[model samples]
Structure formats: structure tokens, C-alpha cells
Target chain A: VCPQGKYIHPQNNSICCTKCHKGTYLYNDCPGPGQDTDCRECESGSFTASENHLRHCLSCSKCRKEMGQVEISSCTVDRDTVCGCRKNQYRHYWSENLFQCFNCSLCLNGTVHLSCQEKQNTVCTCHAGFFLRENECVSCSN
Target chain B: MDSVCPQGKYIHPQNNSICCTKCHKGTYLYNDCPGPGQDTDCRECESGSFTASENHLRHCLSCSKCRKEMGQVEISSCTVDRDTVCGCRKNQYRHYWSENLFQCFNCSLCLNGTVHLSCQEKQNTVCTCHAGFFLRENEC
Candidate 1:
């Protein structure tokens, strides 16, 4: 019997020791003095043991541009992923689920109106009482 | 039978001779005289009058208030030569002179949120807003 009253399965089953779950780890052997182990939970930036984890340790997953994960994925384990804007990018408006950033619209001289969007072209226009001058809107004097 | 009085006197048939008397109040004698004569007869002063002589018995003179169609008032009297000049009362102003005085005009309206012209008279004033500006509340 292993400590904590769990019977070890006999039958040359490699003296079967239970493996830690995907989000936890057991660093040392158990059933020794003060060694009846408890699994350690994975930290935010790292991963825990997985089915394929030979050493009970795994590196964290890397999120792509416009991708995010609240819990990092470990090797052989899936984690929850979210959308995010890439570096040097911003959303059209404040939104938690925005997965991409867009370039801001520039107001040029003689250009009165403009709109920006992500993954699409921006629009620009000159207002009335103004004439296009050098690709910008210039007001006409009375 | 020369019934005419002397050159400087007035002829009074009851007296049967020329009598010399000073002009009464509100009356004037234009020429010097020693006795009752045709030109020496006392004449009532008109509503507006002027005179050059100072020794004349009457000093009462009409003011401009007398002939003013709107602000007319009878003065004591006027001399043979001077006219009475009229004036507008407080809170009133002259716009123009017609047969009657036109009442004071009101202040004109100002454009572009400006309140520059205040209404003091009865007539209205005009104003315009500047370019590139609109009349905001209480402005112009």
C-alpha cells in the first residue's frame, strides 16, 4: 500500500505510480518520509505535466499575433485561447475580444474627414467650403 | 384838420392829443417815441419772438418748447426776434424733425452673438455677424 491508503496495483505493472494531470506536476518520488507527494499546479507563464510529459514538466505555448491564451497550453495538452491585438496595433474601439490592431487614420491638410479600420482600407474626404489643395482640404476665403 | 398824432406819440381820440405810455406786459414798442404815434402803438408779442432792445418793459420770452408739436408748452412770452428751442425729455431722443417730432428710436439688433447696440429709443437698429461666425445665444 502506498502512503495515504492507496493500494499499489500489483502484477508487475511497473509498480504503477499515478502520473500527474496536465495542469499539475510531481517533481520527486512519493511514499518516502514526507514524500507522499501532492501535485503542483502550473504557473500562468508555464505548463504542467501532460499525458506525453515524460519528466512531468512542459514548456508554455506561444501565442501568435492577434492570438492569446488565458491558460498556457502544455505539450500534448490544449488550453483556452483568446483573441488579442498584435504589437504596434490598436483596436478601432475598446473591445476585449479584438484579435487584431488597425492603423490610425491621418488627417492631411485639405482633407477634412477620414475613417480607419482593421484589415481594410481607410476613407478620406474633403468637406464643403473647402477645396482640395495638395491632397488636403483648404478653406476658401470670402 | 390834421387828425394824425405827432411822430413819436399815439393818437387817442378821447384825449384829443398824442399820449405817451409804456407798452403793457407781453407787448412791445419797436420805435422810440415821445408821445402816442402810429409807429409807437403797443403790439402783442407773437408766440415766438426776439428783440434787440433791453429797456423794453417786457422781458418774458418764448422758448423752443412753445412751438414743439409733441412737447409744446406756453412760455411767459417771446421777444420780437429770438425763437424758443425745443428739447426732448429723458429716456427720449430725436430721430428726425417732421411736422411732429419722431419719437426716440430703439437700439438695433446685433448679429453673431453680439449685444453691442442697446435699445434706448423706440426704433430698431440693424447689425450683421462677422464672416465664419454664427449668432450664438446672447451674442451679436
Candidate 2:
């Protein structure tokens, strides 16, 4: 019988249990009951989160700088790269799985009521000397 | 001295005469001969360096790395006679930026539709867009 965390795998004619390690994936099955399964380390740009029998490691994702993103964390053997919007930019979702970053909007004629956030845009309101007209801030000449 | 040296020997030029010198497997020709009968200077290659070929080279090339960020992994180690071998991970394609430079990009996801052509080692996934959506700017 196999222990916990190990999966039952077949050799040429024998049954064996295999348990891959973190940051590694299955390279070859167990040769026999006496030998452990062969596991390969994840390549520099790939990763395996935990123990698995998967044949391949997941490729690391990139932070698309051209899309206004910055890398929060680098990819490692056990984790993917973390990406976020650049400073003074906000995320705009084009689809459920896709997002783009745009420069935060500026309050041209008003005081900033709220600062820009990663997923939210800047919020502003008219200042004391300005009056709201058709969503635009106008100065009171008089 | 012969006008052209036989195989594996490079021509060495003196002030008034020409000679030939040969380099061994582990070393390269460094400087030409100063006299008609004397051999040229030869330099041994340092560790972690270039290809194995018989020619005139000033310096050994630096070994190539398997750039993982470009989706590449080393398949073999570098040796005095050969360079490191590299291959792409599964579901990645080779994208060459220059004649001797390349990276492996991940296969694209075919969102909202079936695949028109499966991704290959050299090409990205090709998809037929959704009924209403169409490809614009390389996006659906």
C-alpha cells in the first residue's frame, strides 16, 4: 500500500507510490519498489507550486510593462511573478481575464477629493471658487 | 614556407617571411610567429567558455545560458567542443529576435472560441474569434 501524499504509480510490472517535491515535477515513474520516482526541478522560468505528478511545470507569467504594469515580485521556482499597475496608473479591465492600465485622471478645475487607487480612478470635486456647470467646473467671475 | 598552410594550420606573418602554426584542442592561436621556424603564441581557454572549432579566434566566446524568463531550459551542458543546448518548455514557442538570439513565449489562449490552428514549437495558437467579436489589433 502507498502512504499519504503519494500516488500509486505503475512500473514495468510492479506497483509503486510516488511523491514529488515542491518546485519539482514528475520526470519518470518509479523503476521499482526499491527506488524513488524521478523528479526534475522547475526550469528558471517555470514553477511547481507543490508536490505533484505533473509532467511539466507551469510557465511564469510576465508583467507587461508596455501595458503600464510593473513587476511586484519576481518569478521563482515555486511562485509566479506578481504584477500590478504602475505608479499614478489604474487598472481598467478589458475582460474578466484581461486588464490594462491607464494614467490616473487629473482634476483640472477642482480640488482632488480622493487619491487614485490601483483598481479605482481619481475622484475630484469643484473648489470653493468654482461652480458646477454641466459636470464642468467654472470660475465665478463676479 | 608554403603560401597557404595545410589543414588545421594558420598562416603566421613575419616582418619579411610567412610561416604556419597550429593550435591544439584545448588552446587557440593567440599571436603570430616572429620568426620563420618558431611557432605562434597559443592561449588556453578558461573555464565556462566558447565553442570547439579549429580556427583563428582572438578570444573564446562566452557560453550561452538557457534563459528561463524566455521560456527556455538547458538540455545539455557546455563543453570545450560544443555549446549548451536549449529547448522550450511545454506549450511554448521559439521566438527569435535575431539570427543568434531567441526566446520562448507561452502559447496564447484562444478565448471565446475553437482553435483554427494548434500552436506549434515555432508559432502561437491561432483561433477563430467568437461570433460577434473579431480580431482587431491582435485581440478579439
Candidate 3:
């Protein structure tokens, strides 16, 4: 009898659903009512974002150079790939998906207070013997 | 006291097998449980080391480096909570030796015929014989 917790197999009406875990996909259909469909772990370069009964997992996306991004996390069977800018680079656009990253500026005549991050540009402050003059560091003596 | 320790806690002989101790991530066991209701003595991983899972290990694992010579590239840096993620470079595929050991190999090129299956990260390309050609003695 069909019930709330039961799902009929697409290929076999006699079999009910057995969940495939997050990192797995349905492989073989059940042969009998009491049998379960075979679930296989997703291979590398493939992933299932959540628990599913899908016959195939989704292909992993690549971190392309044209995107000006590096991989923050490699694709695993359980998760998707994450992309971000490198340490010396920051996102050009404020959006999560950006076309490219721009190189951080060099702190001329100033010291770096904070290094460049993926989202933000480097933060610089005047040197101990210098002071900020119209956004440019000038020698305190002058 | 409960007969069993609570979740995320473990019993150690140093506490006379009585106290429940909790060990958090980013750290490893430095000393055994001290007393009841007290946290176990744990040490944070040092620089260049990490622990990806909850454990009672004496030490954290060293960070692994990408093997450029083997066509591997670093996708992510190691942190206290996660290990470094490595991937094969373009045109390379993975050949797993074990769960933790893998080497990258160049994608195979089909000598003749159409490709039945394209190259995959864990497998080589599957080629089909050209029309009017049959595979015999491993040759088309």
C-alpha cells in the first residue's frame, strides 16, 4: 500500500523508495517489493547537493581563468565547487559572481594596516614618521 | 550520574572512567580527562597543521602540499577545520591509489575512432572502433 513515507520506484511499481544519501545517487532499480534500489556514491568531479534519488549526480563546475577566480573549495561528491579571488587580488564587482579580480594597489609612502582580501582592497596608513596630506603621505618634518 | 556519557562527550580511564569529557574541533588530545564536568585538555593545531574532524588523536595532521610534478594543483589552503583541497590541472585526470592517495595522469587520446565516453576525473576515455573496423587482438 502506498503511504506518506513510501515512494514508488519509477521503473518498478512493486518497490518503494529508499533514500539515497547526499553523496550518493540511485544506480540500480529494485527487483522485488521487499528489495531496495541500489545507491552508489558519486564519483569525483560529480556531486549531489542534497539527499536525492536521482539517477545521476550533477557535474562539477570548473573555476575558469576567464572568471579571474581561484577555487576556494574543490568539488566533492557531497558539495559543489566554491570560487573566490586570490590573496593578492580582490573582486572588481560587489556581487558574489564577478567577471574578474583586480590586483591590489601598492601602498606608496604608507604602511599596510590590512592586507588585501578577496572582497576588499588593501588598507594603508601613514608611516610613523609621515602624516596623511590630502590622501598622500608626507614627511612630518615638512 | 548517567550510566552513559552525554552527546559530544567521552569517558576516559584517567578520570577513573567516570567523567564525561568533550573535545572540540581544531584541537587534539594533550592530556586525558581531568575531572567530572571538566573539559579534556586539548591543544590547538600548530601552524602548518590541521584537524578536519572531531577526534581524540594525540596530534593534528600536517598540511599536505599539492604535487605539481604529478599534475596536481592546490584548490584550497588548509585550515584548522578543513584539509587542503587538491585537484588535477587541465587535461589531467585523477588515478586514485587509495582513499587518501591519488595521482594525476594526462587524459588519454584515442588513436582511432570516435569516443564512446569522454574522459572523466576517475576514468579514462572509452573509444569506439571506426566504421567497418572491428576490435581484434586489442586493435581496431
Q: How many angstroms is residue B70 displaced in model 2 relative to the true structure, after the best TM-score fit?
A: 47
Name the regions of candidate 2 deviating beyond 4 angstroms: A1-4, A10-19, A31-35, A128-142, B1-140
lDDT of 3 by residue, A105-134 (tens): 666555553466654566444455354432
For each prediction in turn, the share of the native Cα contacts (below 8 Å between chains A and B) that it retains comes to 0.00, 0.00, 0.00
In model 1, how well does chain A match by TM-score? 0.32
Q: Give per-residue CA lDDT, model 2, range A1-142, as digits (tens).
A: 5532345775443454345555567777766554445665677788877556788889998876667778778887677887778776888766745777888887655555446777556644444545433223565453
lDDT of 1 by residue, A24-108 (tens): 4544333422222233445554554332223444555554444322223333332434233443233433354333356444545
lDDT of each: 0.38, 0.60, 0.61
Count backbone overlaps in model 1: 39
Model 3 lDDT on a 0 to 1 scale: 0.61
Q: List candidate 3 stretches off by more than 4 Å.
A: A1-142, B1-7, B41-43, B98-101, B136-138
B22-72 in candidate 2: lDDT tens per residue?
A: 443344556765554444455666667753554356677777788776678
List the per-model TM-score of the A chain. Answer: 0.32, 0.66, 0.60
DockQ for every model comes to: 0.00, 0.01, 0.01
DockQ (0 to 1) for model 3: 0.01
